[PDB]
């Protein structure tokens, strides 16, 4: 994708993450744990389902028969009709192929985007108390227990409380 996180600086996805699309997997003194990020999962899902509601509709435009399967119409008019129908088929076949391709490109980039936005959000919370690993991980210098991880996941992590510790640990 255009934002270089999915199939980018993050090596791969997690098959264990069945809770949501995006998540945190932490490592500390109390072991290892994993949890989904609701907010980002939801932004992606909503935007995608929004694409669907737009495309999954049929028009109220009625078309009637202009030729006959049981009793062939005059050849000249029949050939004009077939030519016209074939031309229209060529137009819609093109439109459908382009629509789906450009939608799929945008879907993939948008998903990649949401991951990046989540990644950056966490960086801004952890200001100065952490560093960029480079694989989608934040090395935390101060002691961060499970309670501390939960504060990160839920937008309540006060950096100033631990700032002195992690600063010194530089």
């Amino acid at each position: 994708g255009l934002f270089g996180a999915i199939a980018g600086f993050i090596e791969n996805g997690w098959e264990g993450l069945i809770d949501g699309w995006y998540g945190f997997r932490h490592q500390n003194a109390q072991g290892e744990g994993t949890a989904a990020d609701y907010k980002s999962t939801q932004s992606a899902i909503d935007q995608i389902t929004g694409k669907l509601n737009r495309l999954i509709e049929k028009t109220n435009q009625q078309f009637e028969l202009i030729d006959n399967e049981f009793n062939e119409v005059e050849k000249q008019i029949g050939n004009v009709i077939n030519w016209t129908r074939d031309s229209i088929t060529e137009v819609w076949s093109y439109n459908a192929e382009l629509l789906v391709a450009m939608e799929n490109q945008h879907t993939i980039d948008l998903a990649d985007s949401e991951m990046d936005k989540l990644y950056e959000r966490v960086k801004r919370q952890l200001r100065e108390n952490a560093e960029e690993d480079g694989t989608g991980c934040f090395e935390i210098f101060h002691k961060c227990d499970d309670d501390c991880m939960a504060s990160i996941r839920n937008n309540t992590y006060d950096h100033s409380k631990y700032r002195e510790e992690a600063m010194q640990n530089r």
Binding site: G1, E15, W21, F70, T107, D133, C137
Partner: protein, 316 residues
């Protein structure tokens, strides 16, 4: 010591196409092209008329197989392969245009023309039109000369459409098997039928001669028609060889007409129809039949076009 961000993934993804790439795997994808047919005509909630052995144009003239269809009413009209517009062998001039008018008519209402005849026969029948013995088109009259070889006198008959919608008027021209048998039925000489309306001018001299035996008969009837506007008048000057209208047809409203060889089904609803059945789908495209009618997904040549509904799949 650390906290890591990631995303979900599967062992196997679903291949889709993008602007840049063919067959990139994503977590989930859905089909945009309908391939599922229902092999029935889904008519739940619709006034439906299945013509069976009656041809659509037969509803206007009335051969025996169209007797129960002379004043039908419908949202949906179904023509069948076994349908026939005629009993006595013949065809309509400008047939397909008339079919199109009738397919979306919403059915027909009939009304007496009020023609009275003097000095001629009106009772002409045949073995091709069977209603317990010989008969003729229910809405028409086979006009003949009083006796064999007798002169068919130059006649004038007129009809004014005194209603708020266009009247459909139909008349036939009989082409006998020989020049002799034309004279037998209508007397000798050059038979000339003329028709004139404010929108319309035409004339008809017949043409006797040998056609191949259809329904056992080598004669033909040419059916003709026009749409007579409100307050307009139509006049019939004829010298013989004329199959006169008895009733006129008026169009009830709106319908859709289809051709099909599958059964009707009042348990499923659908607005997109083709000869093999009904396409029920909210998908924007279909690859079932390019001649599907009604309110349909757009026909496209591709069997399948998958739309990504998930992120790119990057497995372990």
């Amino acid at each position: 010591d650390k906290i890591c961000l990631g995303h979900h993934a599967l062992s196997n993804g679903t291949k889709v196409n993008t602007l840049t790439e063919r067959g990139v795997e994503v977590v989930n994808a859905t089909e945009t092209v309908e391939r599922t047919n229902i092999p029935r005509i889904c008519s739940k909630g619709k006034r439906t008329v299945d013509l069976g052995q009656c041809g659509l144009l037969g509803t206007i003239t009335g051969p025996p197989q169209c007797d129960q269809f002379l004043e039908f009413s419908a949202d949906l009209i179904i023509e069948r392969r076994e349908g026939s517009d005629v009993c006595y062998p013949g065809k309509f001039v400008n047939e397909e245009a008339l079919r199109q008018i009738l397919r979306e008519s919403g059915g027909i209402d009939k009304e007496a023309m009020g023609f009275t005849y003097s000095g001629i026969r009106t009772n002409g029948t045949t073995s091709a039109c069977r209603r317990s013995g010989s008969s003729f088109y229910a809405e028409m009259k086979w006009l003949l000369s009083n006796t064999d070889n007798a002169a068919f006198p130059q006649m004038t008959k007129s009809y004014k459409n005194t209603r708020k919608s266009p009247a459909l008027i139909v008349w036939g021209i009989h082409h006998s098997v020989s020049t002799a048998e034309q004279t037998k039925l209508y007397g000798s000489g050059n038979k000339l039928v003329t028709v004139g309306s404010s929108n319309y001018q035409q004339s008809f001299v017949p043409s006797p001669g040998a056609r191949p035996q259809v329904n056992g008969l080598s004669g033909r009837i040419d059916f003709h028609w026009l749409m007579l506007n409100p307050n307009d008048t139509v006049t019939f000057s004829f010298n013989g060889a004329f199959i006169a209208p008895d009733r006129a047809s008026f169009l009830r409203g709106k319908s859709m007409g289809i051709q099909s060889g599958v059964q009707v089904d009042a348990n499923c609803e659908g607005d997109c129809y083709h000869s093999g059945g009904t396409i029920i789908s909210n998908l924007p495209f279909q690859n079932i039949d390019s001649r599907a009618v009604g309110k349909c997904p757009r026909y496209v040549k591709q069997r399948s076009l998958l739309l990504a509904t998930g992120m790119k799949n990057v497995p372990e």
